[PDB]
Structures are given as structure tokens and as C-alpha cells.
Design a protein around this nucleic acid. Structure first.
Lengths: 141, 129, 149, 83
RNA sequence: ACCCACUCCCGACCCGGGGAGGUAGUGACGAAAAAUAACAAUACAGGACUCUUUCGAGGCCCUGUAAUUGGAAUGAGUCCACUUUAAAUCCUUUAACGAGGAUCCAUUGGAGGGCAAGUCUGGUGCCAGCAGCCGCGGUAAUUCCAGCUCCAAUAGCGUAUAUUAAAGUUGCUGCAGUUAAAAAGCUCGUAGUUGGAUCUUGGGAGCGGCCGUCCCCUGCUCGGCGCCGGCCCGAAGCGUUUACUUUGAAAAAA
RNA sequence: GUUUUCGGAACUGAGGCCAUGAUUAAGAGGGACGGCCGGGGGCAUUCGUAUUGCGCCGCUAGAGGUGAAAUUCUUGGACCGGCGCAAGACGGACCAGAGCGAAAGCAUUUGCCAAGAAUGUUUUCAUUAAUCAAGAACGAAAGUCGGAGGUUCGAAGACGAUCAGAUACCGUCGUAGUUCCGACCAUAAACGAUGCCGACCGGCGAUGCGGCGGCGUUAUUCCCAUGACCCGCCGGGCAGCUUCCGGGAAACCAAAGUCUUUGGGUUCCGGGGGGAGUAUGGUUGCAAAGCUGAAACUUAAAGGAAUUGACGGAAGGGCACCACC
């Protein structure tokens, strides 16, 4: 602190109050703009409907094709490219399927090789994509 | 300008002892400096000093050992209950085995250990070890 | 450090330890006061009185010789000025500068030094109103200032 | 030097130092028994006069003001008086 | 879903009524305890000892592993009865059954580094995919897809998101500002904030072995330890004003 | 039937009594005083070459310009040489790690005008102070509006070269502008990239201002006292060197130290890189623009200091008939 007056409580509090806005992690949480522009509307997960299956070219170094899924969210009507996890799990996603969709892990930031894809597909037609991959549940059709 | 005269004093005899001086002039003088020094003397940290009387504020000349590791002021003079005096000596002294917070009580300017047995809190002036 | 300069000067007057009067000084406190009255009547300030006294009449400090100081000797009898000498001299300087700056609008340095002097005045005015040696109704205005010589 | 007798400055050291910075504050001025040879009376003049000290019953003008110590006019003598 | 039996409430009311409330049902929100084996005989191996250069001998002593074998165990469940309770349930108690692959079968995530644990084998070949980050994948992949193996937590374990610590990366404690982000071009200036020194000390009373712990260093209307109008003292009321510190009152439970 | 003492409260006259009442004068601050000091500021006055133009006189064909040329000027006499005249810029050398100023800034002479730090002080006031939301003054250059002037230089533009191109670097012209006056504008790597005030903690020799002291030499010579040197000290300033004070990531800093042994006062201000000083709203401006100022989104770095290497169309040294002489 740069005012050690005994009667300086408000300058020290009112400075700190003003300088907390220059923090990212604070400015984000304490404005509507981060919580509005969030496609999930501040929710953890979100059910949406697959409208196409999309190949996304991996980043500069490594070079695969990352199989993601273009999603119309129910609650918002908003557009999302959400990644599909492990080997050969895009074979489990028929078009126009209700998929439960979570974040990727970095609180709405793009992960690894996948440019501007912040989401993974968790369940497809209310059946878990780990259970389909392990073959425990069979896809109800 | 000069505002905390006890700050100028304790920083000047701290500077001087770090340099290894046998004595140090502290060239404004207050009654609060003189009480603080007498407390540091009773615990043998500084040597028997001397207050030079001009007809303005005095000058003091303080004989030093090499016992005073650091003296220092707490500015501003925060109010200390007997509750809080553990948390000060917790964060402001180098151990429980030695070092003394000086704090001006109503009873008088004195160490934290006498402020316990007299059972009087007050305003923290400084500290030394 | 000075008020309106970067100057860190140390040209101070340094009184001696012994407040006790010297031996040689034969003038009693009353004849010093009588001579202070004679200087005040001629039209001198407590600053100018004190100088003239210590030079020609070997009286170091009037406070040391008498009990009291020169303005309080002027003030007791009523030879003291209505508004203090130091606030008089700043108002005197401000009227001098402002007169120079009537026909010298180019002189931007003068204009800046005027604002520094104006600030010295307002600053002293504010002090003397706390000590009620000026009226609370008083305020130095530069248009009213030329009447205050 | 670490060890200095701060309480006992040797008078060579004290008179060297700035008047304000002396262990006890002490001026560098003094009063003079200035006498002119034309007149009878000894006037007391301040060393750093800063005025024109005149002969009362004019035989001369004694001192003239400068930066520091005033110039005592050629002809005049001075004793420095003390207590 | 069952019930006014508990808790209380309402009424003219010891008597009626109460989806308030209670009791079950669903319930891995979460919290507590806590099974999934223990013990011996053997093959074996490591470690005490007489002894031997080395081997080897003995096991009186230990300790560990083999779907080796052997009985003794006790509850998951099944289930009469009592108890429980408004009536039941669950729990507790207790006849009888109830275990060798004890199949009465523990998962969840990992095993390049951070980060505990394979440079094993088969597949793929910058593909598929993994990968919080750094990175792995183009023909000896410690990272993908599997097998064996090993590690971690364990009836739980992973994931997404908010949030706390870690963050001394919001800094009052406690950050920074020459060059990493950062000192207004410069000065004046009002509220804000901060503000020099200085105003009581010596001893009286008493104890322990020169030093320690105590009582005292304001004054003027009403009565009790007493006295020949007042002396010593008890109880009111005025007594620079505040912060501060110490004590006291008072401050719902949960 | 009363006015009184008595209690009790207001208005007010004299005396005594109080030891009758004012702490000190900050290595805080203001103000006065003194002799200085400075490219401090303003107004005026004055000078100096030089440049360009003009006139006159002389003699001659080139001159300018460039790495090389060309454009341009030029037998209607350019360039050059001599005497003048006019205008407008600018103040060389002296000129410094020198001074002054709040910063921007400030250099011919002389005068006037107010101003200012520093020192000197046994002068005065006596806490008047430090820093600062609001508000305010000044604020390089460019740029804007209305006048005046237009020497040089020269954004745009016209050419002439170079070039692959060359709307550029080079060259010749050249409008706005550069200059002065009045009004804006308020920004610069406006930099010491270092807020202001205060205290303390090393050494050294310098320099500038004032003061104080000390052998000697020189001038006003006729002593003085003043200048000029000389040798010290003190304060204040711009600096420098040096040191394991200490700090720091280091480079480096007597401050950027006196910080985990963390608290002298106070203002502004930063929070990974971009997006962006952008959009938007307000506000100031004639305009150009300035002040305040996000978000989505994007990203694993961007950056600082130092080390080693490679590299250079940098500097120096060295070798070799696979280099030269």
C-alpha cells in the first residue's frame, strides 16, 4: 500500500475496488458480457441437436482431422462446433440427434490442436458416448 | 516534511548499527524517542545514551553494542487489544524467545511482555530484536 | 525545501544557546521599547525595526532584552499595522507584478510567477483567518488590491 | 572512522562545521566596539551589519553593507566584545 | 403412499380435526462406521546360527509366495419367531439353512514429464487417435488401438462448470512502476490524506532477599467509631471535551 | 396595612490580591533586509558577417550539379573579381557533461521593466506545513483561422537521374509552410524512459554561485580596498570517478540502497500477448484531432537482462604464390 494513514480506509478500499477491474478473471465474472456471450448461458452442460458432422484440420505442428459436430443448442438456438472424443465415435452420431455437450476443460478456451472448438459431446440420444465406445450400452434405434 | 520523529530516530540508529558505529547522533528529539530508547536500554540492546539540550528540540547521542539486529517504527500507531498482541509478536518479531514490541499504553511506553502482566493494551509504537 | 521553488536552501539565522542578555548592553528594556516606538513612528516594520536595532544599537534580540517581541510591543500600544507586514509585502509584490503585466501580455513567465505569489497570499490569508487577526469577511481580490498599498 | 567522540567535537572540528550542524547551534557573528578617529564615541556595530551605521553627531559613516561581513571604513578599529 | 401414536396447534373441547407434523417409498446431494477373507501343513525363496574357501548339512528361530491341501470362522443373502411400530418396515436379538475358483467373481482412472507406475509384446504409420500444458503419431510409438503387467484412490472413481486455497498473479498484513505492463509534459491548487519539539516529579507508609510488589500526593448539601460552631470519615450532586486501552452490564436459539 | 435582615437569581462601580497572563524560535515554512549571481522572461534599441535579389565596373566561356551524368543558368555576359544598395532569416568561432528556468525553453550590444534561486543574517511572523480528486496557468514541432512579410530552406507538385520498377534515397526548380502579429490546437523517445517532500548510510579530486579564512605574485600604484591567480573550509546546485554500504533478473544505481529484519508522508498509475488506444457514448475543437474508453474474439507465450555461437553491405589486427606484388 502507498497510503499508510490511519484514517485512509476508503482510499485503500476504493482504490482496490477500482483496480480489481484491471484483472481478467474478475472483469470476466463481474460483467454480463462474458456470461451473455457464453453459448451455454453460464451452464455446465447443454443438450443440442446435431445439424452436420464436421472435419476440423488440426493446428500447425501435428496434423490430423478432428471430427467435431455442428450443434443447434435448444435453450438459446445458438451454433456450436463440439468435438467428439475417442477413436471412431463419430460413427455413433446420426444427424438430427439430441447430444448432451460439455466444455473441453479450459473454461471456454480452445484446447490442443482444435481451432475454436471449446466443447466435447458427452451423451448421444441420452446414451453416454463412453458407454457406446466401451460397448456397454447399445444405441437405441 | 518530518512527520514521524520516532521513525527518523530508529531508522538512523538502525542504519548506524548496520554500519558498525560505536555511537550515533539522532538530531531531532522527543519524549517518545527517550522512553523508547530507555526500554531498549533496560533489555540491554543499546548502551547508556545522552540527551544534548539546546533550547530547541534536543539531540540524543546513543552508545551502541552489536546486539540490536533491527529497531523499527510501525506507522501508523495502530490500536492493539490484548487479543491482537499475539498476532503482532507473531508477524513482527523474529521469535517468541526474544524481540520486544514497544507499544504506548496508558500505564506508559513499554514492551509487550509488561503490557501482558499489567493487563493494558494500547498503540504499537515499534519493535526491536 | 522551498514552497514555490525546487531550492533546498539552508540560509537560516541561528540564535545562540544563552538566551541570557550580554553584559555591555546598557539600554534597559524600557529605553529599547521607547526606541522601538521611535522607529515605528518613522514608518518601519517589525522586520526593519529589528535590523536597525541590532546594527546601530548592539541589541541582538528584543525578546532576550525585554520579555516580549517587536510586533507585540507595537501591538500593545497600537503602533502595529491593521494587516500583517508579510501578507502586506506579498500583496505589495502582487500589485507590482500585475502593474508590469498590464502592458506585457507576452511576459508568460511573469504571469506564472503572479499565480505563485497569488497562492502565497491565499495561503497566508487562510492562516490569519484561523487566528482571526484578519476579518472572516476579508478576501484578497486583485481588483480591490491597489487600495491596499 | 567508526568511533567518533560525537559528544566531544574538538574545537578545530566544531568551528569548521556549518553553524546549524554544530552539536549545539552556535552563530559565526559577533558585536564590534567600532571607533572612528575623528569622533570620541565607541558605537556597537553588528559584524554582518547590512545597513549604513552612521556616526551620531556626524564625523563619518562607519560601515558599508556587503554579502556577509560589512566593510569597516579605512581609519576605523574594532574590538570583538563577548560574554 | 400410511398415520394423528409422537411434536405441537385449533375448537364449545380430558373425547373431534390437522398433507402442520410424524412414518414408510424413491434417493451414490452429502456425512459416519465398515465385508470382499483369516489360520496351519507342505513344497520354494530371503534373513538370524554351529560350520564350509565355494558347494552343501540342520532347522530348533523367523518372514514371504503357489487354483497345493486341510478343517475352523462369520455375514451378504434365504428365513420361522420376538422386538420395533398407530399398523408395519429397517436396525438390534435369535431357531434353521447359508462359502474354496470362498464364480457369494471391485471398480474407476492411469503408467513420456509435471505425477505414483513398463523404454514389454501385437496393430497403425503426421492416418486413426491421444494430449488440462509441454508434447506423442510419417516403419526399432515408454504417449494412439489392444494383450499381459504395474500404479493410485477404493465401494467408490472419472468428467464439465461456478467457487476457495495455491494468488505476495489485487498485495491492509504484502506486489509492482530506469530497461519486462507501468510516473500525469510541467507546475499551481480546493476538499481528501499526513503533519515538528514542548506543559510532573520526587519521595512519605509497609514487607522479601542494593533490586523487587502495594496505599497516598482536586473541592463544596445529607449523617456514624467519636468530641467541648467545627475537626477525622460515610452517601449524594458539579467537575476540558473525544479517540484509545481494561473492566462491567446487555446481547434468540441452531 | 407594610418594608426589612434573611435565603436566592440578574445589571453594574472601585480597590487590593494573582510571581498577575505570550514555551521555544525547528539543519520546517513564509516575509523583510544585504551584496552578489545567471544563454531566466518581457519591451525596446543596437550590431555582425553570410545568403538572395538589384545596379554599376572588369575580363572571359563556361558555370551549376553528381559515384557518373542530366534538368537548370549562359556571348541578351552566367559563374568569377570589385564597389554599393535593398529585404528577410539567423546569431558562427568564444560555447563547456558550464549557467538559468516548473517544464516546454533560453546566446550580438545597450537601456528600461518587474521576477528569481543560492549564500549572508544574534531581522520578523510563529506551524503558517507536505502531497494532492475539482479547478487552473504555461506547454517544442507540426497543423488550423484572419492579417503583415516573403531571404533561405522546403511537405505536395513539375521535372532530371538510378532502377527491373523508384510515385524513394541523389540532383534542379518549387506551393503550403518556415518568419512576425492576434486567435486556436494541448500533443513528442514532452526522456533521467526514474512523481514530490523528509531522514539516514562511503571515499575522492574537480567545476558553478555565495560566504568565510590563509603564505605569496600581479593591476588600479601612493598605501588601502577591491578585482585576477594561489591554498583551504562551509552551504546550495549541474555533474564525474571510485568502493563487497546495500540493492537488483541482470545491465547497472550513493540511489533504483536503508524491503520477508517487509509500516516516514502523499499523489498518479500497471496486472500475460494480441483485439486496441479500436468500436461506442460523452466532452473540448472551425478543422485536424485531443481527453475519458470497452467487449466479443484470438493466443502459449510476447517480453527483459545477460552468456555462447553463427552472421554483418561495421571497426582493427594477422596469415597464405590453392592470395597479391
Amino acid at each position: 500500500g502507498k497510503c499508510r494513514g490511519l484514517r485512509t480506509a476508503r482510499k485503500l478500499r476504493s482504490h482496490r475496488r477500482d483496480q480489481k477491474w484491471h484483472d481478467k478473471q474478475y472483469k470476466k465474472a463481474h460483467l454480463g458480457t462474458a456470461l451473455k456471450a457464453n453459448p451455454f448461458g453460464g451452464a455446465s452442460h447443454a443438450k443440442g441437436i446435431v445439424l452436420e458432422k464436421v472435419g476440423v484440420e488440426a493446428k500447425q505442428p501435428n496434423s490430423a482431422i478432428r471430427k467435431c459436430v455442428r450443434v443447434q443448442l435448444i435453450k438459446n438456438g445458438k451454433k456450436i462446433t463440439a468435438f467428439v472424443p475417442n477413436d471412431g465415435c463419430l460413427n455413433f452420431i446420426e444427424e438430427n440427434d439430441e447430444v448432451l455437450v460439455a466444455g473441453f476443460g479450459r473454461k471456454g478456451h480452445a484446447v490442443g490442436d482444435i481451432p475454436g472448438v471449446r466443447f466435447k459431446v458427452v451423451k448421444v440420444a441420452n446414451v453416454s458416448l463412453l458407454a457406446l465406445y466401451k460397448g456397454k450400452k447399445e444405441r437405441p434405434r | 516534511v518530518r512527520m514521524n520523529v520516532l521513525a527518523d530516530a530508529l531508522k538512523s540508529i538502525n542504519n548506524a548499527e548496520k554500519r558498525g558505529k560505536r555511537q550515533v547522533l539522532i538530531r531531532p528529539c522527543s519524549k517518545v524517542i527517550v522512553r523508547f530508547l530507555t526500554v531498549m536500554m533496560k533489555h540491554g540492546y543499546i548502551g547508556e545514551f545522552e540527551i544534548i539540550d539546546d533550547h530547541r528540540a534536543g539531540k540524543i547521542v546513543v552508545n551502541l553494542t552489536g546486539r540490536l539486529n533491527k529497531c523499527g517504527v510501525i506507522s501508523p500507531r495502530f490500536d492493539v487489544q490484548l487479543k491482537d498482541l499475539e498476532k503482532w509478536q507473531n508477524n513482527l518479531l523474529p521469535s517468541r524467545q526474544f524481540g520486544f514490541i514497544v507499544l504506548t499504553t496508558s500505564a506508559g511506553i513499554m514492551d509487550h511482555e509488561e503490557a501482558r502482566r499489567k493487563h493494558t493494551g494500547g498503540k504499537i509504537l515499534g519493535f526491536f530484536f | 525545501g522551498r514552497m514555490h521553488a525546487p531550492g533546498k536552501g539552508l540560509s537560516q539565522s541561528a540564535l545562540p544557546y544563552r538566551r541570557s542578555v550580554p553584559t555591555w548592553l546598557k539600554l534597559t528594556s524600557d529605553d529599547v521599547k521607547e526606541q522601538i516606538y521611535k522607529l515605528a513612528k518613522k514608518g518601519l516594520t517589525p522586520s526593519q525595526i529589528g535590523v536597525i536595532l541590532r546594527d546601530s544599537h548592539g541589541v541582538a534580540q528584543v525578546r532576550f532584552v525585554t520579555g516580549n517581541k517587536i510586533l507585540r510591543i507595537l501591538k500593545s500600544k497600537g503602533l502595529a499595522p491593521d494587516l500583517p507586514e508579510d501578507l502586506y509585502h506579498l500583496i505589495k509584490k502582487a500589485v507590482a507584478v500585475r502593474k508590469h503585466l498590464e502592458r506585457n501580455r507576452k511576459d508568460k513567465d511573469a504571469k506564472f510567477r503572479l499565480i505563485l505569489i497569488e497562492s502565497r497570499i491565499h495561503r497566508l490569508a487562510r492562516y490569519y483567518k484561523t487566528k482571526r487577526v484578519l476579518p472572516p469577511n476579508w478576501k484578497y481580490e486583485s481588483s480591490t488590491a491597489s487600495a491596499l498599498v | 572512522p567508526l568511533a567518533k567522540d560525537l559528544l566531544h567535537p574538538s574545537p578545530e572540528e566544531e568551528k569548521r562545521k556549518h553553524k546549524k550542524k554544530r552539536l549545539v547551534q552556535s552563530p559565526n557573528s559577533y558585536f564590534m566596539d567600532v571607533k572612528c578617529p575623528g569622533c570620541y564615541k565607541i558605537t556597537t556595530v553588528f559584524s554582518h551589519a547590512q545597513t549604513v551605521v552612521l556616526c551620531v553627531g556626524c564625523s563619518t559613516v562607519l560601515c558599508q553593507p556587503t554579502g556577509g561581513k560589512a566593510r569597516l571604513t579605512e581609519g576605523c578599529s574594532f574590538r570583538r566584545k563577548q560574554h
